[PDB]
């Protein structure tokens, strides 16, 4: 489930999320650059010439960072976010799942590959790999008993309890980005208050037509749906769905 | 404590940005606990703080201050001028960030009149890098239509 | 121009390749690029930040009233029976 300690530390160092200032973004580049190679032409240099910035200053720090302690000829993703002050933030990301599958082909393989692609390296546990391995195997397909009957339920129980623990331990930033039906603790409140992006995520959650407001709106719509088509007041959505599926 | 009577008629202007030159400091105390109770108020206060950070000033980051109150009744905005007078713009439902900006700027013009009447000298408004950044979007809109 | 080209001093910054490689890059080096050095960091600067004068406000209100009366007059201009039936059947197909 979790990669080696040295590999995880190395990944945390290379794929970092610097504190974003929160200014009005101009655009987002998703480029593919190798470690030992400096891109200054059509893929990156042309965009930096269109924008007016110097690609050399970016290539210097990129070659200073990704070149050492890296395997040669490894395609790496770079997400660059440009703000209205003509300033850019670039973040490195591991190779795409397509490149990983290509290198693997020249479930064990799929899980070992998906071990390398979490959503945030600050917490390699969340999200659970077994959910994204589904998309990994789906992309692979797009490209081209007595032990099982107990391991299925063992893994089901482990997945369920880990999902519950994640729902309980969701931090303040994740709470503001996506609502949560578990009580909030003062410890997590202080942990989220220490983070600087708290103000940015707060403004984005306060602005309407956001994902947070959409989740709140669909919660309210489900409440109204229960209040309108419920056999009784204290009706749970699970039993309501059972009624729907058994009454058609 | 003034040597002259105060002004009578105020200039009419749709104040879209803040001007922290005649303003000593601002403390915006906001509550980040829950927002389903103040979606309008929290958004208004946060965008007002954002505009105050992006306001017209040499270094507005040194004059603007934000305070998270884990247990607060309603977000407050305290403004202290060069004299030290404390003013509180009331925040109600339906009040927009532009509304708060206009309130604060009207009260700032009144306070600047009070300072000039008392005898305090004030740095006058002139062409600044913020004015150039504003003429940027002025050129943009004049080229649009 | 080749001598005093931009970033031409990088050959002289590092006195040795070993001394250059001794330095370790961090995410702070990436984060420092997002901060403008001369000007102060500001969140947003859009067209809504443009303050309006009294004449501009009166002109904008006049343009809004003109747009209102223009919509009202177009409600009768497009009310020519052909276009009116067109919009009516379009609304019927929308609601159906």
């Amino acid at each position: 489930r979790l990669p080696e300690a040295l590999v995880v530390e190395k990944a945390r160092d290379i794929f970092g999320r610097p504190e974003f200032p929160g200014k009005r973004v101009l655009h987002n580049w998703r480029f593919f650059i190798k470690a030992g190679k400096a891109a200054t032409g059509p893929p990156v240099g042309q965009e930096f010439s269109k924008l007016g910035l110097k690609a050399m200053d970016f290539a210097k720090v990129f070659n200073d960072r990704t070149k050492p302690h890296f395997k040669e000829d490894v395609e790496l993703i770079v997400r660059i976010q440009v703000y209205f002050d003509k300033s850019y933030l670039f973040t490195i990301e591991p190779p795409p799942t397509a490149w990983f599958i290509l290198r693997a082909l020249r479930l064990e393989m799929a899980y070992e590959i998906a071990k390398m692609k979490p959503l945030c390296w600050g917490r390699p546990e969340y999200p659970l790999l077994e959910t994204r391995v589904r998309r990994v195997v789906g992309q692979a397909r797009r490209m081209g008993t007595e032990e099982c009957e107990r391991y299925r339920r063992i893994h089901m129980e482990q997945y369920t309890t880990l999902r519950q623990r994640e729902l309980e331990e969701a931090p303040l930033i994740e709470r503001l980005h996506r609502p949560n039906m578990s009580p909030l603790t003062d410890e997590q409140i202080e942990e989220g208050l220490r983070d600087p992006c708290l103000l940015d995520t707060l403004w984005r959650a306060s602005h309407p037509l956001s994902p947070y407001h959409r989740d709140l709106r669909e919660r309210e719509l489900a409440r109204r749906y229960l209040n309108a088509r419920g056999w009784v007041k204290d009706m749970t959505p699970e039993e309501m769905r059972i009624v729907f599926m058994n009454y058609r | 404590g003034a040597k002259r009577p105060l002004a009578v008629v105020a200039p009419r202007t749709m104040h879209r940005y803040l001007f922290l030159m005649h303003m000593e400091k601002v403390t915006i105390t906001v509550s980040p606990l829950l927002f389903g109770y103040g979606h309008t108020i929290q958004k208004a206060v946060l965008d007002f703080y954002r505009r105050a950070i992006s306001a017209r000033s040499p270094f507005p980051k040194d004059k603007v201050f934000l305070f998270y109150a884990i247990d607060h009744i309603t977000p407050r905005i305290e403004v202290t001028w060069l004299d030290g007078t404390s003013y509180v713009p009331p925040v109600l439902e339906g009040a927009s960030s532009q509304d708060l900006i206009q309130m604060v700027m009207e009260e700032a013009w009144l306070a600047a009149d009070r300072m000039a009447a008392e005898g305090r000298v004030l740095n006058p408004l002139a062409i600044d890098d913020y004015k150039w950044d504003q003429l940027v979007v002025f050129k943009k809109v004049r080229d649009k239509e | 121009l080749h001598a005093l080209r931009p970033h031409g001093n990088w050959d002289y910054l590092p006195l040795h390749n070993n001394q250059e490689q001794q330095e370790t890059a961090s995410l702070e080096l990436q984060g420092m690029k997002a901060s403008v050095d001369i000007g102060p960091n500001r969140f947003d600067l859009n067209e809504k930040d443009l303050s309006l004068d009294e004449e501009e406000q009166v002109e904008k209100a006049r343009l809004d009233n003109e747009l209102m009366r223009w919509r009202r007059l177009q409600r009768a201009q497009g009310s020519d029976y052909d276009h009116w039936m067109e919009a009516e059947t379009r609304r019927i197909q929308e609601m159906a």
């Binding site: 504190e19 600087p196 | 305070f67 | 403008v36």
Partner: peptide, 22 residues
């Protein structure tokens, strides 16, 4: 008798370093 028988503040926000350090 039966009932007794059953019975027995203001913290400043942290500006990101990319904005506060310059």
């Amino acid at each position: 008798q039966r009932q007794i028988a059953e019975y027995t503040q203001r913290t400043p926000a942290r500006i990101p370093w990319t904005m506060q350090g310059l």
